[PDB]
Design a protein around this ligand. Structure first.
Ligand code: NA
Ligand code: NA
Ligand code: NA
Lengths: 100, 100
């Protein structure tokens, strides 16, 4: 079991990159702000995220500030790192009807 | 939305501590090892976890090596920290029938 579901806004969206094996790869910087319940609290969390393959292609050029629901697994950012990165398995924009 | 579900083993279990407001607090160090789907692999993740209140009392003196399913929210360890901490909302040992 390793699944993080997070509501987040796009702070940064990288240019299209690739894995050493030639698969599309895209890095995003995400910010989450919410109030949660702990022992009967607000949280602000900044987190790096990476999408590979088709999802990287879909998330290409996501405007900055876009609000999203995402899901994936957590992993250390680099070998031996304290920094974690969210490996995206799902991402959807919070579509609205304003929208002006 | 901010929920991480993780299967993990206890590498460290702290002594009973307290919040500044006097609530029970307990820190654990958890290791996760699994293989996941990345579209498309192996993930090994070490993460600090903190339980407050009644869950802290329940998790007191968890033997090192105990395997668990945990759930909670992610938050930075401190301002501008790259270290994240799982704020435990649920924890259960993986009970088995072996013995010994
Ligand atoms: Na897993
Ligand atoms: Na790779
Ligand atoms: Na939330």
């Amino acid at each position: 079991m390793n699944t993080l579901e997070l509501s987040a806004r796009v702070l940064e969206c990288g240019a299209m990159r690739h894995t050493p094996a030639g698969l599309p790869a895209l890095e995003l910087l995400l910010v989450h702000e919410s109030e949660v319940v702990e022992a009967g609290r607000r949280v602000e969390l900044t987190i790096s995220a990476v999408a590979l393959g088709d999802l990287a292609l879909l998330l290409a050029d996501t405007p900055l500030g876009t609000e999203m629901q995402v899901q994936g697994f957590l992993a250390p950012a680099r070998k031996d790192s304290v920094k974690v990165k969210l490996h995206l398995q799902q991402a959807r924009r919070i579509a609205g009807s304003m929208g002006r």
